[PDB]
Amino acid sequence: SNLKISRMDKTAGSVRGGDEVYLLCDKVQKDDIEVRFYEDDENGWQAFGDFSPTDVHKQYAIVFRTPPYHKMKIERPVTVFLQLKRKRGGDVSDSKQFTYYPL
Amino acid sequence: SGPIQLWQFLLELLTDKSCQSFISWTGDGWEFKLSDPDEVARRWGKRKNKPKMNYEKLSRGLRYYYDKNIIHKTAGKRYVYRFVCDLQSLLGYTPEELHAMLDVKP
DNA sequence: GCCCTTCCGGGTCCCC
DNA sequence: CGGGGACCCGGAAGGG
């Protein structure tokens, strides 16, 4: 049923992507789960955490890699959101913060 | 934006100061050098779950980019390759600007 | 189809 | 000189 991010390993990363995040969550199916990063402007940026079905641990955790931001040129730390999302299902989770850094 | 691609992985490395010892910008637009190729291939291998990854094979990844407007070789220069694709749109900066932030001694 | 990964046969260097 | 051993080049097969 409903999707919950219980807690996360970390809530900040480099704008360049690649940061490894341990997300703890309620029951998920390895083959019907996606981690969507987003920004809710008219710009409407989205991206997906990079992981595989084997990185999904006993139905209750995901180990994944952050995607890049849409740009590296920022001089004050930016904040985007993220949610769990079923590929087939539409339904998503309560969306946690994530924060991108320069350099 | 799923499984990261080779060109994308190298770009990630290129923007980390803590990786400059084994991969770095030459200081000429988007030209870059794998100063320690064994290391670079070891990390690419790690990210993609391929223990037996080496530069010989990673290089074949790079050669499939040659007709695809992503990356070219710089003829004659050992381990030197050039991004031909639109990096200024991807990462906000020009090459000169990026080189400044990352202390690139050309 | 895509994007490599794994091979390979062939080419040019340089160095022992 | 003759060989190995690096980089390189792309074709072919195959996986996920």
Residue numbers in the entry:
A (entry chain A): 226 to 328
B (entry chain B): 332 to 437
Paper text:
We next determined the crystal structure of p52-RHD (residues 35–329) in complex with ETS1331–441 and a 15 bp DNA fragment of TERT promoter containing −146C>T ETS motif (designated as p52/ETS1/−146C>T). The final refined model contains the 15 bp DNA fragment, p52 residues 226–328 designated as the dimerization subdomain of p52-RHD (p52-DSD), and ETS1 residues 332–437. The DNA-binding subdomain of p52-RHD (p52-DBSD, residues 35–225) is assumed to be disordered as its electron densities are not clear enough for unambiguous model building. H3 inserts into the major groove of the DNA and contacts the GGAA central core specifically. In the p52/ETS1/−146C>T ternary complex structure, ETS1 recognizes the −146C>T TERT promoter exclusively and concurrently interacts with p52-DSD. The interaction of p52 and ETS1 buries a total solvent accessible surface area of 1187 Å2. p52 uses the loops flanking one end of the β-barrel of p52-DSD to interact with α-helices H1, H4, H5, loop H4–H5 and N-terminal region of ETS1 domain predominantly through a network of hydrogen bonds and salt bridge contacts, supplemented with additional van der Waals contacts. Structural superposition of ETS1 in the p52/ETS1/−146C>T complex and the autoinhibited ETS1 showed that p52-DSD and the HI-1 and HI-2 inhibitory helices pack against ETS1 residues 331–441 through overlapping surface regions, suggesting that the HI-1 and HI-2 inhibitory helices would interfere with the binding of ETS1 to p52-DSD. On the other hand, binding of p52 to ETS1 would displace the HI-1 and HI-2 helices, therefore counteracting the DNA binding autoinhibition of ETS1. Within the crystal lattice of the p52/ETS1/−146C>T complex, two p52-DSD molecules homodimerize through a 2-fold crystallographic symmetry. Such a p52-DSD homodimer is essentially identical to that observed in the structure of p52 homodimer in complex with the κB site, suggesting that the p52/ETS1 heterodimer can dimerize further via p52 homodimerization to form a heterotetramer.
